[PDB]
């Protein structure tokens, strides 16, 4: 049947799938660097550290598969929350969703090696020898972030990940495959492509046809990236790249080859020659190795006029760069067996193509977008839209006992810190956590009071292992608690933010049933000023030392502050904002510029986007991790946004008015925000 | 409708066009053709070799009068048409524009 | 639930089927050459039989 | 089957056999694989209709003359004249409501008539030597390779030398050539796209790669029919079904535009011309053996030895070779019935003129590839004709068609009709009269016509929303500027308008307003007036009895009718307001727009400051646009001569009373073309467009065609009319120029 | 020691179990051959014996 | 199942063809031991 063309055999050491012709493999699943943050320096610099490991390990035997693929998600489940205005908001802002793309960027780069009693221990060498390989790639990728898939249990009958990439390059879906006595290339391909018998389409069945796209270019590539206008686009394609090293020897001859090839000639081009003869000099100095390469764009429409139309409009987008498509009118087959890796010999025309070309072919650029699912609470908590046209899943659980959770939100109140804190707060209520939150102002009150949880501000006239409770007693001698209630709190931090001493003694106490009362169940901490409660001289010591605990429970500090310069990153307050996974800076008209990007090590191009986006501009960038982007969560007609915009904001007079709303109406379904609606739209008008 | 006009001030072409190259009749490489084929047939007799020339050159004399130069196109057709292989299985003569998948 | 102790085998299955695979290669050629004199053997006889 | 695709792949032919080129050797010229390079002409042809019959045979002599030096056995000549359907033209994008739906109505007049235009290439090789069996010979021997670098460079030499000798010939054409133009960082080759455009029936751009260009230049799979007359292209784009045509009988006379009927049609199509010229001793005997086959009379006819005689005498000490020619016709179209009819019409009209024309059969593909202007070896039917009647065929004849897209500003603002059925893509900027000039003076006699196109032609404009300040006649205009977001600012008598005499560097500019204020003098008050100007007995009187805003609108105009007696009005008047517009010259596009220069002769200085400030705002985005109702007393003016030297694009309306003096004098134009313009008579729409050198009387119109309702009134100029929509505007009193309703209840008593 | 681009590429497009499969097909075919000329060799003796 | 099972089903298969070829060399050796003594009478 189809299990001619599938070559994969069956799994070995955890980390690789060894094949037909005894030639095993490794799969990396590589998010690539931000090309859109960093300036042009960064960019040949990446491509340059990309060169030496791959100069470095580079061997007759390496060969290394670039697949990007676009998927059309649909691990985003749109959860169920009981909450009334959560739901309000949700429904709105993904009806704002329409129209816009939903599609994500997934680059793999996969790492295979074919060698060219005593049998025991030259296998040994054999797979000592991908050992190293990845070990080296580990270590060359740890900016970009490379995931070695390998085997993971499920109920007692073991599952390869590797397997799943390489399914989904057949199958076009995500089907997981578990280990079996089997031989994997027997049953892997469940869906099997039927292409026409003329050979100028194929069709797949769920139907969805494809079409193929060839592409070779010859000459040596203007820009490290050509190949970023796809990033964009109306089409699901895969995009495959092929690198067999070739030895040096075998270069030479092929230089040599070429070179007397071309002097043989009616008309002497002594352009052309020049340049190969300086190429051919370039090799023994500039250490680059070369390979055979092959491209082959493989676009995906529910329709062949539309497969049609997509090819013309990627046609046309290549030839906006200096890259001509040539269209694959037969030996699709061929073409499309190509890209799984290990198939070396469907290869359509393989061309050598110097290193450095190839990585600037193929360099790990793609927009920032998270991981929609597989988060360790479930999906992606919200989903946010991008400049450049791309979504961005938000999921706070990104980092480099379990992954950071901790979040820093840097910007002027005024400057959408409300808004994007509330509708945060609203999307992680899917997950139902325990929140616990203290405000600079009252603004956070209204909404707290919207959710289920009921805001407790402070005001004047309201105020064994016990001993530790005693202790801290006689520090401020110097000088409804529990989570049983509801689910949600909020304590007002307003009224000593700007003390200067009553602070430490009542935080200290809070935090003790705070921490106490659930302990493990699950914690998702918010202040609006964190720098306020660590000049504690007890409060910040254990929140150093217990984070690790708090870390392995379902515990995250999602911390916040207005001014970073304001937190001076004390001695203490260092590993708290260290630990910091995910950082979110809002526009900042004023921002120190060298605390600025030291205490966040926030790079220099990073910052000119900052303030590019200067003052007043409801947009944020987002640094997960290693990477970057600008969201904006921008809230316009397509038209509620309106009125859970003017609930979600909190001002004195909304503040005072849900307050006597709350006391005065004893039972309310929520219903004193129709009562808010309108009452407070009058007063501004 | 045409800037062509009836004028008489001609640039006449003289009606060269008819009179391309011929030696007895016929343009000398169809008829060496001819004399290829009657020295093909001597090989198989020697009897008819010569006697065959007469009918073949007869036709070819009287087949360039009518249309001159008409050989030329059959050569075309033979080398361009004829050779081409595949032609069945696309309906048509095609030429593909990549070029040998292996070129090895 | 050795997970690895079932597939620690599959390795040395793997280079015993590449084994068996040339070895049988090996004794093919061995047996079609033996036969091939052999039965040059036997023509040869008979070639010489024939008068 | 997998194996089955490997197998068949390498049992297929690729193209790239009969695609014979190969790297640029130079930025203007291709190399081939058999050293015969090659250079492509962009012509814009010379204007035909104007029906010139004496014109067109000294055209063709002279074309004769100028070729004879160039006429040697090493060369050839691969004439194109590709007609195409335009898709480049992009529909405008529009604000203001008359504008638009002027835009919309004129867009749907176009239903039903044909946007093709065509353009003509000429390519002209050089191959080394053109031996009849010594080239054979040559070819199967090693060369070395710096004489292979000497071949280069004696090949390039000499067809630089052809190039420049050509396009010094071509002045009255276009004559442009086309060459390497780069794009984004990496090199781009203009002539290959043309090349690929023959080859692959569609206009791809082709980037130049280290590769060679035969291999990567086809995109589209050919698939010529067995046993058939057309093939078929599979392309993304769309299938494209290509029929071929062949001429096999020639006629003596030769009268020039024998072909030029094919040039209006309603088929697109590709005509080639291939006149590989042919050395002299081959040429006298290709002549004898027609003396010899006509000697061998028995009195086949008496003056037919007479008619050739002079042949020899003119071979030996005329201008002209004797060449190789065959003519191939590539219709494209989009079914096999459609290219079929197509091609039995393309026959009718050849055989309308005294060729004789056959389908070509058996040799389809043979006669694709003899498309392309360096295969020498696939011409399917050569013949022996002389160059006149090569020129005769091929006469750089076109129908005026000026750039759709490309043109400076961007795309043609407007489309216009024809009366030869050409669609005109007009356009303000002209080739010759660097930056191109945009100056346009649209004389005419008393035609309401000049009001209603300069009207269409700014509302038009519109597109590029560019900032236009107009200087209008009885209130002609008023209407119009109102209609899309424009201040009329009108300088009726009694009030002074909006802006006093006063200006707020500024006392440099108001220096020449006092010198001007000096009237009935001017000696003393150099400068008694300047001091008083620091901070004239009549000047007092004039300031008593005198009897603004900018950049907030895009439009201006200005009710200037009444300064026609006094200059010492109508000179300061234009002093400040010029002076007004010249900051906003420098902001974005601008064209200024007048109706008289009478009015501007007045001034008597603005000559003086024009002569260079035209050029200065020339060059940074600036038009001139210019209008006479009375031509014959315009050239008159001592400015007037630099008026008709400096415009760019010519319109003329009809005039009963034409000058032959003036109009030949200046307006530079031919005889035949003076007779054509006085040729209509006075109401006629039709008006004749001399952008540039080449001429066509494209003609407008408005009727209905199965609309304009509305707009005819508005683009019109009447004094009656223009005062009640005032009375209109002053009732209703509203900036929202979408105003127009209100005004079109008033229609009532005018459109009852 | 490669010293060929045609090796490399034929190393790389070749297959080697395929190749193994395709040798004992050619080992047998030749093996037959082999027991044709013997049976040849039989009958020329049974039919000259006589 | 999966390479095991092809690994014991060549690993008798060619079992298989190697006694059928040295049984058809046993025939063929016995068959001209067998006619030939019958030819020395």
Redesign the interface.
Known sequence: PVGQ?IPY????T?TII?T???EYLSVWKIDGRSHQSASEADVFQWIRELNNTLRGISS?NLSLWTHIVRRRVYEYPDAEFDNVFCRQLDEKYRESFTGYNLMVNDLYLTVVYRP?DQ??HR?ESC?KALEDINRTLGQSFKRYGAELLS?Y?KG?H?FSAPLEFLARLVNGEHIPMPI????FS?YMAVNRPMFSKW?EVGELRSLRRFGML?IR???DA??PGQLNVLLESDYEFVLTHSF?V??R??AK??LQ?HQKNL?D????????IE??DEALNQLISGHFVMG?HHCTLTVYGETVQQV?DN??HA?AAM??????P??????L??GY?AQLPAN???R???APITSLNFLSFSPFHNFMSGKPTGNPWGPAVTILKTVSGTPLYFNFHASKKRLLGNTMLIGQSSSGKTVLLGFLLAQAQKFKPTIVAFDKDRGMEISIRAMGGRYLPLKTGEPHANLIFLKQFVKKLAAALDLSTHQIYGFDITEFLDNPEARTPVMMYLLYRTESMIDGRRFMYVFDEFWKPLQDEYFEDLAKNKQKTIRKQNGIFVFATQEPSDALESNIAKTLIQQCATYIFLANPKADYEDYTQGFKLTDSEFELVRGLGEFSRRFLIKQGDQSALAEMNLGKFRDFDDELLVLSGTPDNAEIAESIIAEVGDDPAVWLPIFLDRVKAERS | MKPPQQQHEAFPLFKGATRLPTIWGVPMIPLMAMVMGVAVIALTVSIWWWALVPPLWFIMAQITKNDDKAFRIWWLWIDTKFRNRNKGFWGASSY????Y???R | ?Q??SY?EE???L??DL??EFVKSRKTAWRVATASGLFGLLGMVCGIVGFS
């Open positions: 063309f055999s069956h799994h070995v955890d060894s037909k012709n005894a007759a060219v049998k025991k296998q797979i085997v249990e007692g073991a079996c006595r089997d031989r027997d050979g060839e270019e010859y000459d203007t820009e067999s070739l030895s020897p075998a001859e092929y080859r002097i000639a009616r008309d002497v081009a002594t352009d052309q340049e190969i055979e049609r090819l013309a046609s030839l906006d760069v200096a890259v001509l040539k269209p694959v009118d037969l030996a087959e061929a067996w070396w010999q469907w359509p025309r393989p | 593909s524009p990549a070029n998948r292996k070129r | 639930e997970l690895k597939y599959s390795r040395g793997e280079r590449i084994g």
